Amino acid sequence: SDLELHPPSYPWSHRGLLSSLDHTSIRRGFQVYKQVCSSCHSMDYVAYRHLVGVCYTEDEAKALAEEVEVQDGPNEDGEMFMRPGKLSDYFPKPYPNPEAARAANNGALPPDLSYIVRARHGGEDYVFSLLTGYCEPPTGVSLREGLYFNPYFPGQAIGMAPPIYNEVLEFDDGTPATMSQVAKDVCTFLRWAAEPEHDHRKRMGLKMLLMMGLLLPLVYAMKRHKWSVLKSRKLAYRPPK
Amino acid sequence: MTNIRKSHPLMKIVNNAFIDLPAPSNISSWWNFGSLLGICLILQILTGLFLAMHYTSDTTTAFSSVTHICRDVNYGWIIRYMHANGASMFFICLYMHVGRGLYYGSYTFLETWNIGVILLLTVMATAFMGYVLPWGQMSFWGATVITNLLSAIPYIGTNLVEWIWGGFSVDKATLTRFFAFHFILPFIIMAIAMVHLLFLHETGSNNPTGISSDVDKIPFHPYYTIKDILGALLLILALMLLVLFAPDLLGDPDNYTPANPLNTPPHIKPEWYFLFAYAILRSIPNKLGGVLALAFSILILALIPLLHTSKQRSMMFRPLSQCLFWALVADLLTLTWIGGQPVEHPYITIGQLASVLYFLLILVLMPTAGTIENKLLKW
Amino acid sequence: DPLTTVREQCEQLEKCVKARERLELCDERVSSRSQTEEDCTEELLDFLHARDHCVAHKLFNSLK
Amino acid sequence: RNWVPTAQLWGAVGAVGLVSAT
Amino acid sequence: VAPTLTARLYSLLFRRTSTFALTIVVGALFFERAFDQGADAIYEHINEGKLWKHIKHKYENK
Amino acid sequence: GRQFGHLTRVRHVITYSLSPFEQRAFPHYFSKGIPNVLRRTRACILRVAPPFVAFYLVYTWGTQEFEKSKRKNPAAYENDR
Amino acid sequence: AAKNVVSQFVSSMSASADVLAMSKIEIKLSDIPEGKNMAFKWRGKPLFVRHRTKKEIDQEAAVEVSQLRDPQHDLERVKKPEWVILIGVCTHLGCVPIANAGDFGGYYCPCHGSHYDASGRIRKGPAPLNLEVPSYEFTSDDMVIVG
Ligand code: HEC
Ligand code: HEM
Ligand code: HEM
Numbered sequence: 001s002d003l004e005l006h007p008p009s010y011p012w013s014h015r016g017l018l019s020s021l022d023h024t025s026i027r028r029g030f031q032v033y034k035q036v037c038s039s040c041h042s043m044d045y046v047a048y049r050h051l052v053g054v055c056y057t058e059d060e061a062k063a064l065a066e067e068v069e070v071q072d073g074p075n076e077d078g079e080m081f082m083r084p085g086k087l088s089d090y091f092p093k094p095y096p097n098p099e100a101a102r103a104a105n106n107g108a109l110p111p112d113l114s115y116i117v118r119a120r121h122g123g124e125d126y127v128f129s130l131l132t133g134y135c136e137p138p139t140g141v142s143l144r145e146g147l148y149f150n151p152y153f154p155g156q157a158i159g160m161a162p163p164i165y166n167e168v169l170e171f172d173d174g175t176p177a178t179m180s181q182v183a184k185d186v187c188t189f190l191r192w193a194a195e196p197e198h199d200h201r202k203r204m205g206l207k208m209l210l211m212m213g214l215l216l217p218l219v220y221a222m223k224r225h226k227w228s229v230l231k232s233r234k235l236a237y238r239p240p241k
Numbered sequence: 242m243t244n245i246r247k248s249h250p251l252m253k254i255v256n257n258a259f260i261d262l263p264a265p266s267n268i269s270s271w272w273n274f275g276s277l278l279g280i281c282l283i284l285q286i287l288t289g290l291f292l293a294m295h296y297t298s299d300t301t302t303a304f305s306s307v308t309h310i311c312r313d314v315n316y317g318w319i320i321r322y323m324h325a326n327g328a329s330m331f332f333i334c335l336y337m338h339v340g341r342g343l344y345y346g347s348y349t350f351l352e353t354w355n356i357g358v359i360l361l362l363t364v365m366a367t368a369f370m371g372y373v374l375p376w377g378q379m380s381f382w383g384a385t386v387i388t389n390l391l392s393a394i395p396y397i398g399t400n401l402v403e404w405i406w407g408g409f410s411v412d413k414a415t416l417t418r419f420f421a422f423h424f425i426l427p428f429i430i431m432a433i434a435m436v437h438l439l440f441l442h443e444t445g446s447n448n449p450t451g452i453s454s455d456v457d458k459i460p461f462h463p464y465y466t467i468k469d470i471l472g473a474l475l476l477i478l479a480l481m482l483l484v485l486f487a488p489d490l491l492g493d494p495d496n497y498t499p500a501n502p503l504n505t506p507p508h509i510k511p512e513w514y515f516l517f518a519y520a521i522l523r524s525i526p527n528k529l530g531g532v533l534a535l536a537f538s539i540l541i542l543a544l545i546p547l548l549h550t551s552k553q554r555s556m557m558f559r560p561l562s563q564c565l566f567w568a569l570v571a572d573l574l575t576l577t578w579i580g581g582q583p584v585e586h587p588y589i590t591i592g593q594l595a596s597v598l599y600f601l602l603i604l605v606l607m608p609t610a611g612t613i614e615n616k617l618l619k620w
Numbered sequence: 621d622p623l624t625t626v627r628e629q630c631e632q633l634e635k636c637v638k639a640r641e642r643l644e645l646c647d648e649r650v651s652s653r654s655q656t657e658e659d660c661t662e663e664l665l666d667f668l669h670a671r672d673h674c675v676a677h678k679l680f681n682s683l684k
Numbered sequence: 685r686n687w688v689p690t691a692q693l694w695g696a697v698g699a700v701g702l703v704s705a706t
Numbered sequence: 707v708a709p710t711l712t713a714r715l716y717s718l719l720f721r722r723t724s725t726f727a728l729t730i731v732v733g734a735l736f737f738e739r740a741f742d743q744g745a746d747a748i749y750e751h752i753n754e755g756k757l758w759k760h761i762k763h764k765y766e767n768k
Numbered sequence: 769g770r771q772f773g774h775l776t777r778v779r780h781v782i783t784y785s786l787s788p789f790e791q792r793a794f795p796h797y798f799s800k801g802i803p804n805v806l807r808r809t810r811a812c813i814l815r816v817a818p819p820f821v822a823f824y825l826v827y828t829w830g831t832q833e834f835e836k837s838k839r840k841n842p843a844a845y846e847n848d849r
Numbered sequence: 850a851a852k853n854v855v856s857q858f859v860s861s862m863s864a865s866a867d868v869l870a871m872s873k874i875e876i877k878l879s880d881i882p883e884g885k886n887m888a889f890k891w892r893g894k895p896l897f898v899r900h901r902t903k904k905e906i907d908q909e910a911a912v913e914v915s916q917l918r919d920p921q922h923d924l925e926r927v928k929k930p931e932w933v934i935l936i937g938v939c940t941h942l943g944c945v946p947i948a949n950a951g952d953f954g955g956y957y958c959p960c961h962g963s964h965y966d967a968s969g970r971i972r973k974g975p976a977p978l979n980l981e982v983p984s985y986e987f988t989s990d991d992m993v994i995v996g
């Protein structure tokens with residue numbers, strides 16, 4: 001029954017109704033997942049399909065895809081003799097099966113990041129605030145080594161190694177790799193993995209709003225056209241009496 | 242008659258129920274929910290069939306299949322979300338339809354109302370199973386908790402709960418059953434809706450005033466077809482606003498986490514539409530007393546008719562009635578709030594008083610207020 | 621780099637300065653027995669909350 | 685009579701409808 | 707005198723429902739295209755350089 | 769059974785109505801509504817508003833307590849002693 | 850409004866990002882040395898790619914059309930003389946033909962004695978119709994896309 005400081009309402013570039021994803025961020029944040037994360041957490045519903053969703057070419061991601069199959073390859077999926085080439089293969093499972101996973105992390109089970117932002121309560125605000133949130137145990141507190149103390153975990157503890165630290169990786173362009181700068185890019189790539197349809201959807205919202213701003217006022221007219229007969233009507237009562 | 246299309250085919254005459262039907266002139270905008278109620282049910286069905294057209298009813302795949310629906314299938318993402326948010330609208334509409342029965346005393350239509358309750362409980366079964374369909378952490382634990390609730394029955398219960406599940410837990414068997422039941426239920430529902438229509442077509446609609454409007458009738462086609470269409474536009478606008486710009490907003494449950502049969506729903510709860518009942522349920526210590534008073538929350542509706550005390554079937558001219566009517570609505574709001582609340586003191590003591598309030602308002606307060614108002618008017 | 625500077629600024633505002641006093645005490649005002657239930661978390665969370673609200677708005681204009 | 689003209693516009697409509705719609 | 711724009715429109719296209727439908731069929735076509743073109747543009751303006759459309763340059767043909 | 773000519777009996781009542789085309793759909797769009805919207809809302813408000821107001825107090829208080837009692841982890845009984 | 854709605858609903862039946870991908874996903878290198886009959890796993894069946902030899906072509910061209918169990922002139926299957934692409938499943942009771950085996954310089958069905966010439970063509974055994982030819986286009990010189 002420990003307070004959870006879940007309140008975060010992180011500023012964002014897609015916080016607004018019309019606001020869309022920044023793929024450069026998506027791009028960046030992908031690498032983050034691939035280098036910093038791929039190790040323990042999976043992304044099962046994630047195919048190598050960034051191409052247009054991530055601005056990676058077909059040739060780009062084919063090649064990015066290929067090496068991931070050369071080293072983690074279908075040999076961990078059960079394609080004995082599989083190597084470079086394929087594109088329908090999903091992100092490589094850090095371990096052969098869950099049970100293992102928990103052993104490599106000592107009883108904990110590294111959550112598939114596919115949906116993290118959409119799954120847990122609080123979306124990419126919490127994920128950002130977790131990773132970027134790591135503060136000193138509170139006077140009087142004890143901690144088993146694996147039980148690092150994180151200011152935003154329900155039970156006030158997490159089994160999480162240095163999620164993200166300064167100069168953990170390097171991006172192509174040169175984006176300053178700051179713990180947080182890296183997190184901002186990591187979250188984003190997460191938002192998108194949780195909801196691919198984020199951009200289409202909001203464009204659609206635009207077209208559904210404009211359209212509806214033409215049909216609501218038109219069809220109201222139509223409604224007064226007809227009704228007018230009744231609303232304009234006047235009565236008169238004239239008994240013989 | 243010759244070449245009067247409508248009467249020629251006999252079948253086509255049966256459709257003049259939507260054209261040449263005498264329709265009260267005066268008529269709040271709370272009368273579109275009926276028509277919306279029926280668009281809803283067609284919307285779900287459509288959408289549904291489509292989802293069912295790429296969904297698999299197994300423990301292993303279900304979540305995956307859902308997940309596939311909203312990723313690799315073309316436009317499978319809106320359809321699904323449209324389907325989920327659809328069911329919030331269908332309930333939102335549902336409660337508007339009833340609020341009106343309550344308020345203008347439409348339930349004077351003894352027989353039509355009855356079928357309404359039947360309808361209302363029949364949608365509730367369907368929304369309770371479909372949620373299970375995706376097989377998410379929330380769905381998996383709420384299906385367990387609710388069906389096990391049933392095991393409160395002393396002699397049978399236990400055996401029963403097991404037959405429903407088709408095993409000792411909620412594994413395959415269970416899941417496959419909900420799919421099939423979810424599927425055919427709504428088709429069964431549509432027959433009912435239509436029988437519902439059938440009985441109302443014998444007496445017509447009631448109105449704000451609460452007086453006969455045969456002296457004032459109006460052809461359905463000219464007017465009300467436009468009104469219905471406009472209401473549908475507004476209806477669709479709310480559904481898409483929510484689908485397109487606030488997808489899960491309303492879908493409280495974030496649990497997009499495949500269900501692991503040994504975990505912790507911190508605060509497990511039906512979706513919004515069922516919180517009243519839930520709240521109602523917790524307020525009782527004993528689990529059998531909770532189920533009965535869970536059943537009575539909803540079934541109470543079948544007695545309203547027999548609780549009506551006034552001479553004015555229209556609350557419109559009756560102020561004390563209006564005041565308690567609204568209270569119970571806000572009480573009802575309060576009860577839904579409890580629904581997402583932790584199990585604790587503050588919420589318990591509040592929920593307890595709100596349950597009492599809720600039966601008081603329907604069982605004892607209103608009826609008295611009825612007589613009082615009638616005495617005041619010297620009736 | 622970015623994150624680490626903004627954080628400090630945030631805790632430099634009169635309401636950060638004011639509620640850091642409840643942290644400061646608790647962080648040392650614990651007795652001898654060390655009543656484990658004396659856990660300083662409550663008080664810390666308060667600070668953190670206000671620090672971060674601030675952080676977020678300013679920290680954002682600093683990244684890429 | 686007026687049917688040819690009207691059948692001709694009705695035939696037009698179906699045509700353009702398919703063409704576009706489809 | 708001349709017919710108000712409406713009256714012109716009226717006697718050319720709406721008297722005969724056959725013409726009235728035709729109209730609607732053709733306007734349904736023309737309108738889609740401008741709406742989309744305009745509406746799309748609008749949208750894409752609000753997220754300048756945020757969308758692949760804007761960003762394909764970096765890794766494209768050298 | 770016919771619904772239209774068998775509903776009721778009316779004697780001596782003249783009604784006068786005009787066509788849509790000769791008329792306007794929206795006469796005083798805002799000058800009628802305003803005062804009509806105003807006038808009925810002010811007769812609603814008293815009947816309607818109250819119980820929702822009350823729910824809001826209950827909400828507010830009710831959540832206050834919760835966060836206190838729980839956040840006030842020392843609330844129940846003090847530290848020093 | 851109805852146009853998009855309806856055309857979204859209809860699309861949801863037409864194909865899938867998933868089924869799509871894999872459907873036509875197939876390319877080949879030019880490593881297949883005249884002689885060897887490679888083999889690929891495309892669409893859940895065997896995809897045989899045979900680079901061939903003037904000798905091969907020459908002889909296969911000179912089979913009689915009139916007498917074949919499944920009459921079908923070599924020259925109309927392959928889009929390129931030099932290359933022959935097939936589906937690797939025996940049209941009899943479904944075993945897999947053996948690359949360059951059996952009495953005919955083609956393939957061999959080790960199940961009932963089913964002999965295939967270099968084209969696909971049935972020349973001995975119960976086998977009914979000749980091994981079937983997939984759809985595919987040759988892209989640049991080094992590229993071949995099955996499906
Ligand atoms: C291996 C070491 C890693 C790496 C590289 C990352 N995580 Fe993270 N993580 C790990 C474990 C063993 C756990 C379990 C914690 C527990 O059960 O106490 C977690 C947990 C998370 C969470 C917490 C959510 C929750 O359980 O409430 C999140 C949000 C999370 N992991 C995300 C995450 C991200 C975004 C990472 C890359 C930047 C990442 N983890 C790295 C182990 C590991
Ligand atoms: C008519 C009353 C109906 C209601 C109230 C209803 C409601 C629901 C709800 C609340 C869900 C859960 C989806 C989620 O939140 O993930 C769902 C799912 C589903 N429904 Fe319905 N539905 C109805 C009718 C139908 C019909 C008629 C069909 C098909 C004939 C159908 C097929 C499905 C299927 C296959 C799913 C599972 C995939 C998914 O989760 O979207 N439903 N339904
Ligand atoms: C599937 C669910 C339902 C459908 C499809 C449906 C449909 C309709 C329709 C189309 C109307 C005519 C328009 C109107 O009166 O608003 C109507 C009226 C009515 N409905 Fe329903 N309804 C449903 C649920 C209910 C429920 C749950 C109740 C009560 C429990 C109910 C009770 C009534 C009553 C009393 C009337 C008539 C009141 C009057 O107009 O005087 N209905 N319904």
Ligand code: FES
Nearest residue numbers: 939944958961963
């Ligand atoms: S399977 Fe080929 S001859 Fe029998």
